[PDB]
Design a protein around this ligand. Structure first.
Ligand SMILES: CCCCCCCCS[C@@H]1O[C@H](CO)[C@@H](O[C@@H]2O[C@H](CO)[C@@H](O)[C@@H](O)[C@H]2O)[C@@H](O)[C@@H]1O
Ligand SMILES: CCCCCCCCS[C@@H]1O[C@H](CO)[C@@H](O[C@@H]2O[C@H](CO)[C@@H](O)[C@@H](O)[C@H]2O)[C@@H](O)[C@@H]1O
Lengths: 420, 419, 420, 419
């Protein structure tokens, strides 16, 4: 079939998305696994959408959708609230993310023999976190104000970072894919240390440039004074993708850049008392509307990601490695998190921290990166990265997300009473 | 790969923003600014690979159009249609087709091209979109009913302006797509077959259209979905469903989507059935949904215009503007009136001359500008030399530009000097 | 596989061609059906070459190969020898070709219900003749000098003409494919008469223009005086394809044009006694070499055509309609020819003509046009021309060529003694 | 579709003919005339769509090359090779590679491009083909052995000039094709891995080459085929077989074919086995076959050159000729000698300087000119920006032109002033 098949796919996607959201609206079950299972049914079960096409879309979505999503997530948070607990988090992401990634790598490595790189990329994928399916649930069981903040921040920050780790890990697996400066710093200064140097490098660059472009955007809106639709929205998207582009060109993760810009505009209010208020309020409201708009967009993107992930998976590989994946998953949930969150114990009680450690689930970003290695393997051949291992990784990640979301979402309340 | 895409989207959207700025503060209509800026971005700076832009255009040509026409379908009043339904119907069937033919004759006798090619050009330049005229309407206080009938004309010509292109296109491909139209053409000749095919198309499209609209509303009732993002996802879903099925039955999915848009945009009808209580809520929810979609459609519009700007090549358009302008003036001065003269029986002569004269060509042709060239270049069909493609496309560009601008300058003079 | 699969295909083609030619060199059996069967084996039997790829090549070959072949065939004959029997032949081709085409159309029509057009195109395909596999055989059994000439001429002339009929017939089946002037003359003056008017038209145009370009070529070689390789060869090809191009642009069969040019250069010797002989002999020999070269080329092309035809066929359709095809074939052989060659009886005896009528076989051109309708059906969809009918036509043609060549080649000698 | 193709072939071949004419009567070498005429035909007249020409080039790049290199393999003397085999081997391995590297350094420091891109450029401009020099050789009476070693250098550099390109190309594609070279690069680094890969390639290619050659001759004996067209079909068949299998085992099929060409061209060897009676006949049959194939190869050569002429775009080449010429002079004056200095140990200094200086770049680079651009444009690989492609290609054009012409003008002066 021709591009009308793509449209058909689109309709099926959105429709099923709506349906699933209805299920969640009508049943306390999180919408994520519903999305996934729905994708599975709509895909492999009924062969309505083929995996090849599914992936063909999935790359596009993997880019744009994630950009929008991350940007918006950038918009959502509040800098004061994060500054409140700033020292805690930076370590938390940096150490946790990497440590979780590394240890799970070791974890993955044992279950199926693989060069570390494979494991490390697995963890790098599972790196990110998404308690977006818990945030409502927290309010639903009188969860304290304080921790929700730091967790939210953790997710919003680690989402792009998991990618970086992933892109780093992948770059290690395939020579040409690695950017220039990484290659240089690697050959020159080893891979272990090179990873770190490039880490601090691209992080610093990305965040700084993100700030730059962000405030530049703010000033632009200031002078231009665009309070009316749709130019503000268009400008927003253009800005995000700009940050992403430039960021990626300079061998950095443009995702983090855009995200950062989102944080800026989302939490930047600098003005001279000489300035009128006729414009500040207009820009405020404008920003608000644009934000909500992109919230909708990001929602769409999210739905796409989960469902497509659903129709992406190969049942055979899954079932074949069903159990193993499970062990890996629960293992990750109950070992990777607590062990990588140990060095925060000096800030909260042996009981207190246990919650936030044991609670962290895995969602969007890893769901979107599950097919990436497979994508490459299909696109480019490499002995280090077999297609086989691609399918394996993807399957395991699927299981991981499922298990994580389900178990965490289910066992939240029990924790509360049993800890507070 | 995707990096270049990101760059492109960035500069396009940014471009659009800037263009809306300069249009805002200079008061000039935004469209020509769009086209010219796109011109800058593609060929002038050589920043954008024309062919990639062509790919993106291949993307937008269906989806952007679907969305745009859907939202257009929303912004409609069934009542105001009901008032002048015969005027409209006469204007969008007979008038449109006649316009196509006439334009065809023009193109033929100006380029020595085959009449089929000319007719293709006509079909492409059929649809109109005077969204830029509206502010001038409410500003110079043009009579309401006129504005209404013109608008309602556009909303209907946009999708009908598409099928006719697909017709001529299908006529160029020797196999005729092996579709219904092929058969009809074989059993009754191309003319008759074409007519019957048209009627089939429109009929089924509208029936299935209102069908899906109703099914949609009903679905909302049973499901009771009133919140973002569920409602929007639903809307898009329905749109593309309509389109997909539409084309699946060889009918203009665009027409279908538009019709569904009409349904939703004009559905306070089954309100007295259920308690109005929740119904008001769904009404306003639909309203905000519509607004959102309006924004989307605006975006897609920007895409289309700017991309059209970038895709053209100055060599051809220059070498052929000397004739091109003449073609444009030609259609503006001859095609519309001769096609709208049957409408003289209902309305006044002055009113007639006005509504005929004021006929700007907008988005839809721009979206179909590259289409013949694309099909020619891709399918490598013998009847469609690529040069012909460039010719048509350029001609379309000229036409659009000139039409939009002089129509935009017509009003103040055109009103007072006759009405 | 990538374009190396095409190369593989090439090797297989030529190799098997060589093999088959060895068989014919080592066994009196004509090389044509050997080629075909070889193609069948190498194709459908072993799936070494897929039908899709096979056809993809087959279009290319269908063009260029035929051009070269027809051109060379143009070169081969001698104008004096044809002028000897000129009145006989013109009628013979014109009437026979059309009549054979028409009657076989009726013949095809009865065996399987079809609109005439289908039958007419069948006959149009079977139109051409190729006794190239008999020409040696004639010498092998002391066949008289006279008839071989007229038959040779008949083939060389009817080969392009069968195409025209075919292209005409096809054009009738698919609207857009028909050229401009045919369309006009058809709508204006009916299809029956339109066919004739366009026939005389494009024939006259093609032959005239062919002469023009031909002598133009001769003069060019004269002034330029290119006696050395390879410029003469390149120029030859360029000329042929030129004639073909221009011919096709003016809604005429460029094949016939090129062929005609070939006839010209092959048999044109005009010079002033004032002119030296140092150049005439050089151009003579040059022409000779170029001719032989293109003979080789044409041979290659021929091999391609037959073998690819072999790997093109669908065994299922064949077997399904095996018998029917046979009846059609022998029917054609024993009815179409004699009945369409009746009006030459006023020139030769009731016995004499019977030979040349009953002997005409069908070869190259029809072998190359067997897949054309199918080609279109696959490329373009049309209710009048189903893919089904495409496969059918192709199969029937295959059977026809096989049967024709085999039976004629086998039963030649018996005729001689039993008639002379 | 095919109509345009026919037009193209017509004008190309005709063009070639004319070019050979003007080259014949003006005495000037035919190659630059080829390139310039192609220039006329493609961009100048806009007669030929550059991209279609690119397609055709994609066709010729394998087949034309296979034939050309095969026939080249024929025209060879095993004896004369045996004489200076070490000189040759040293010249085609170490010398060639060194030339590539040096050119790479140049390209890098002149365009700021990555060293890999430069090296790609080097690999492309590696191979040489001085077929235009031969007449000047026999005319100005250059020493025989020199001519021989240079020729035998070319015949071997042509295919080796290809693999190195495929190397750098493979290096650009991140997956490295997942081939042997990938593995070797992973286990031993790109340098070592590349070397070992090279040795593997050459070894297997030659072994299998002579294998197929022998198998070919033997086949002829058993089959006793001495006549057109059987013999020719056979030849081509064998060539493409060699190529196919060659590439199937990730080896340069070009190298294989060339080697088989060497085998056939130099096989009077097993004559004393069988009665020479029929053997003389097969010998001469092989001779005429070779001649035929020579004609073919000439044709393909014309194709390649003219097409190269048509494919380029004057904008880029102009905007970058200022540097381009410098790059060319650069390689001619620096790359060869520094790469041929190890050959100083065998031959005299004057002879060395001569054979080094006189190093024209011919067909093979021209065939690989568009290849990086093609792969970049098609695969859309991130490391290969299309602009880079245009740059490389143009640079190659400049290089070829200048090299050929100044080398062609070198000889008369270059001989007497030092030898
Ligand atoms: C700018 C002019 C003032 C207008 C403010 C715009 C609305 C911002 S307030 C904005 O409202 C949402 C939908 O009503 C609420 O979202 C809530 O989430 C709940 C979680 O199950 C759902 O029941 C929703 O129905 C809603 O009650 C609230 O969490 C959010 O903060
Ligand atoms: C121009 C200088 C003189 C050289 C003349 C070139 C050769 C032209 S003569 C040219 O020779 C062919 C191959 O030997 C012959 O072809 C013959 O056909 C026979 C049919 O089974 C085969 O046995 C062949 O071996 C050969 O004897 C002959 O029919 C043809 O006419």
């Amino acid at each position: 079939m021709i591009e009308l098949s793509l449209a058909e796919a689109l309709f099926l996607i959105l429709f099923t998305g709506v349906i699933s959201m209805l299920i969640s609206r009508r049943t306390g079950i999180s919408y994520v696994p519903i999305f996934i299972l729905t994708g599975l049914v709509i895909g492999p079960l009924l062969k309505l959408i083929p995996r090849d096409l599914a992936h063909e879309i999935f790359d596009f979505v993997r880019v744009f959708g994630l950009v929008i999503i991350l940007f918006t997530e950038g918009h959502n948070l509040s800098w004061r609230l994060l500054k409140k607990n700033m020292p805690t988090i930076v370590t938390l992401d940096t150490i946790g993310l990497i440590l979780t990634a590394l240890i799970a790598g070791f974890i993955f490595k044992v279950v199926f023999n693989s060069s570390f790189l494979l494991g490390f990329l697995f963890g790098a994928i599972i790196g990110a976190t998404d308690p977006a399916t818990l945030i409502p649930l927290f309010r639903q069981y009188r969860v304290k104000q304080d921790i929700e903040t730091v967790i939210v921040t953790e997710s919003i920050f680690n989402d792009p970072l998991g990618i970086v780790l992933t892109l780093i890990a992948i770059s290690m697996l395939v020579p040409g894919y690695g950017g220039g400066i990484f290659s240089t710093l690697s050959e020159k200064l080893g891979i272990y240390a090179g990873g770190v140097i490039y880490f601090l490098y691209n992080v610093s660059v990305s965040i700084s440039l993100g700030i730059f472009l962000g405030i530049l955007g703010y000033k632009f809106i200031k002078r231009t004074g665009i309070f009316d639709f749709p130019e503000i929205e268009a400008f927003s998207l253009s800005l995000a993708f700009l940050g992403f582009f430039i960021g990626e060109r300079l061998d950095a993760s443009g995702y983090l850049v855009a995200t950062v810009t989102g944080i800026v505009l989302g939490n930047y209010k600098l003005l001279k008392p000489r300035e009128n208020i006729r414009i500040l309020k207009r820009l405020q409201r404008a920003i608000e509307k644009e934000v909500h708009f992109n919230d909708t967009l990001a929602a769409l993107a999210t739905i796409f990601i989960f469902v497509l992930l659903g129709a992406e998976m190969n049942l055979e590989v899954i079932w074949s490695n069903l159990g193993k994946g499970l062990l890996v998953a629960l293992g990750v949930m109950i070992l990777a998190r607590p062990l990588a969150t140990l060095p925060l114990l000096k800030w909260w009680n042996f009981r207190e921290y246990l919650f936030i450690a044991l609670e962290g689930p895995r969602g969007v970003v890893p769901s979107a990166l599950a097919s990436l290695p497979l994508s490459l393997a299909l696109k480019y051949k490499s002995p280090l990265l077999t297609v086989h291992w691609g399918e394996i990784i993807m399957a395991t990640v699927v299981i991981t997300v499922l298990t994580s979301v389900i178990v965490e979402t289910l066992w939240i309340p029990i924790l509360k009473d049993k800890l507070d």
